[PDB]
């Protein structure tokens, strides 16, 4: 197999896959990156609001 550097991750979630475009992905779904902070879920991937 091929072992690379770190740019990808893995997430546990049962939410469906949809046809849209959002930079941030959380286990519950996808959230806009417009707002600086977020309260949905701690686990995040990509450009996301800071969790509070």
């Amino acid at each position: 197999f091929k072992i690379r550097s770190g740019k990808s991750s893995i997430m546990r979630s049962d939410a469906p896959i949809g046809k849209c475009n959002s930079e941030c992905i959380t286990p519950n779904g996808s959230i806009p990156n417009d707002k600086p902070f977020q309260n949905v879920n701690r686990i995040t991937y990509g450009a996301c609001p800071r969790y509070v």
Partner: antibody
Amino acid sequence: QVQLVQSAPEVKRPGASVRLSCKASGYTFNTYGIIWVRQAPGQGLEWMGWISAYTGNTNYAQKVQGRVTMTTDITTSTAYLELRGLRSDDTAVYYCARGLLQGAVILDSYHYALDFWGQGTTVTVSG
Amino acid sequence: EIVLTQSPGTLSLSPGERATLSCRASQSVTNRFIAWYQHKPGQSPRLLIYGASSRATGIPDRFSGRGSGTDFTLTISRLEPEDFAVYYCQQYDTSPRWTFGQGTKLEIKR
């Protein structure tokens, strides 16, 4: 629709002064300011100045500060750009476009961009 | 001033191929600024991407803005003949100054 109409092309001489127009339709004039950008032959776009109907305050580019005066008349939604002491490099196509939001705080960047442009006035200055 | 450098200056792609343009800012910019324009020759410039990644009203879904910080990108999926133009980088700052970019030309066809 939101539409911007500009003045007819002008052919001035070096050292003269040219007055350019930008009439606005489809949106209330006081809410947004109008900014002017020019394209010299074989050159990229260059911002020059911004004026607001809500606030007469004007910010001009460093290249043209002493020679540029921008005025606005609410009736009838007409913006004027005056350039004095024209020199050969000033020969360009001058566009106008709606800019900032005035009268309300904003969050969406549409009110921080230039969407509805004019056809553009082509100004040629030569002796 | 803040200087935005576009890349590549000339890009030649075949019709139906994705195209990626890159604009690097001299200093960090909040995604609230940095917008992308299109200038077909002989016509008024058009606004494609406002904000950082938001399509303007009445713009084809293929155009996709993205990026953050110094680097911002515009990606065109399934290039069509309407798309041949010069594309311009833009920023904004508190005292209104709209510093443009040099421009990238799409010399499509082969």
